[PDB]
């Protein structure tokens, strides 16, 4: 059946635990670590503070062509673990280069404001 959308979210919502666990979503981020053994990945982003994680699982996808600190785009769903907290089960992902992260952030912020503008 037709899946729920890749609605846009950013690391702040997972770090703030705002975006509920067990829900679909889409985000970009900066590659930090990759585990070839267990097929697990960490992307990082900081709220002008300590870098905040995003736990991801390499399912049906290939994590290539961009490096650590370089940029990637993912969509899927997150689920909780007591020790690990929660991890995104990927559904689509790819590397991307030459991006304008503040611009994307402005885009999503405007988009959400416009959502607020809907009666």
């Amino acid at each position: 059946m037709l899946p729920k959308p890749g609605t846009y979210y950013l690391p702040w919502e997972v770090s703030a635990g705002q975006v509920p666990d067990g829900s679909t979503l889409r985000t970009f981020g900066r590659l930090c670590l990759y585990d070839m053994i267990q097929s697990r990945v960490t992307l990082m982003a900081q709220h002008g503070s300590d870098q905040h994680q995003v736990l991801v699982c390499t399912k049906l996808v290939e994590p290539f062509h961009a490096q650590v600190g370089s940029l990637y785009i993912v969509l899927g769903e997150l689920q909780h673990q007591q020790d690990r907290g929660s991890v995104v089960k990927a559904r689509v992902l790819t590397c991307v280069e030459g991006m304008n992260l503040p611009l994307l952030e402005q885009a999503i912020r405007e988009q959400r404001l416009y959502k607020q503008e809907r009666g």
Binding site: P5, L103, L104, A107, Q111
Partner: protein, 361 residues
């Protein structure tokens, strides 16, 4: 909602009805389908048929005649019927001469790159131009054209994402209808009280119905048997006018109905819509609008520069146009039909009025 319930048939006074619109995918489902006619949908009054949407593909069902690609764009998701196309009449690859080799090679470049734009895999960015359809109660898009978006980075996606609210607020959010609403409002609708007026309304409805049915030729009796046209014609006005033959109300009124049908088709001849070819018949008529044949001929006689003059003429003059047509085809070609076709041609972009009375193509 009156304002939402825009004039019947949702006329193209509002331009968007003719051009691919750009709405959020999520909104594409929230719109209604028109209860007046299927195959058309509504948003804030503005009627929509052709839609434009760009996102990423997330699922596939492959069929013999079409593919079915599930597509997402952030706000929502849908599935899209992407009719396929085969390469019938295959172009071979041969060591042709310089010109032929170059033509074939460039054609092959174009073809292979078209394939690369056409072929697709999940997660990719996809653009589709097409219209809204519904099936199994589910709403979908049947694409007129679709191609892979070759962007290496989200910049163009970003542009679209930033844009859509802009175009919404500028154009689509505008509900108002600025038409003057110059409606007749059924004045003397059930009875014209005047056989000429009845004939005028009859010709109106009859040309409407003929253009609807696209009938190119017709015997007048064929038209005289139409249910709606009959109903319009047999209103009490004609029964009262033909009532002088009290002993033959039925017969006199039916004869008057046939006569007023004749009068309507004659009014059409006068206005150049229909005409009686040199068919030797007494009530056979050919409709100009459907007369693609005469369109083609009169387009030949100037599209190919006017053949009679040696001098480098830019086109031809109304009178010489008419005269060369009557010379090459038939003197009986009325000026009314000639005017009608000259109008329709420039409507079609098959002729242009550089001035009045002289035209080119």
């Amino acid at each position: 909602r009156c304002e939402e319930e825009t004039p019947s048939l949702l006329w193209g006074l509002d331009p968007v009805f003719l051009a691919f619109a750009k709405l959020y995918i999520r909104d594409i489902l929230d719109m209604k389908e028109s209860r007046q006619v299927p195959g058309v949908f509504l948003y804030n009054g503005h009627p929509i048929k052709q839609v434009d949407v760009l996102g990423t593909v997330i699922g596939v069902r492959e069929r013999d005649a079409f593919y079915s690609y599930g597509v997402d764009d952030s706000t929502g998701v849908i599935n899209c019927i992407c009719w396929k196309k085969l390469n019938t009449e295959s172009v071979s690859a041969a060591p042709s001469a310089a010109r032929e080799l170059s033509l074939t090679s460039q054609l092959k470049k174009l073809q292979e790159t078209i394939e690369q734009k056409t072929k697709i895999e999940i997660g990719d960015t996809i653009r589709v131009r097409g219209s809204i359809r519904t099936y199994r109660e589910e709403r979908e898009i049947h694409a007129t054209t679709y191609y892979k978006v070759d962007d290496p980075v989200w910049n163009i996606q970003i542009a679209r994402m930033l844009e859509l609210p802009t175009i919404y607020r500028k154009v689509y959010d505008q509900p108002f209808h600025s038409s003057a609403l110059e409606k007749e409002e059924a004045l003397s609708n059930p009875g014209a009280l005047d056989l000429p007026s009845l004939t005028s309304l009859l010709s109106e409805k009859a040309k409407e119905f003929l253009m609807e049915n696209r009938v190119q030729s017709f015997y007048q009796q064929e038209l005289e048997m139409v249910e709606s046209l009959l109903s319009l014609a047999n209103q009490p006005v004609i029964h009262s006018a033909s009532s002088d033959q009290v002993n033959f109300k039925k017969d006199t009124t039916s004869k008057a109905i046939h006569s007023i049908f004749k009068n309507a088709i004659q009014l059409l001849q006068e206005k150049g819509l229909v005409f009686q070819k040199d068919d030797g018949f007494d009530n056979l008529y050919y409709v100009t609008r459907e007369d693609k044949d005469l369109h083609r001929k009169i387009h030949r006689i100037i599209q190919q520069d006017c053949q009679k003059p040696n001098h480098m003429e830019k086109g031809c003059h109304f009178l010489h146009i008419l005269a060369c047509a009557r010379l090459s085809i038939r003197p009986g070609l009325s000026e009314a039909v000639l005017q009608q076709v000259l109008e329709l041609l420039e409507d079609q972009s098959d002729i242009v009025s550089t001035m009045e009375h002289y035209y080119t193509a």
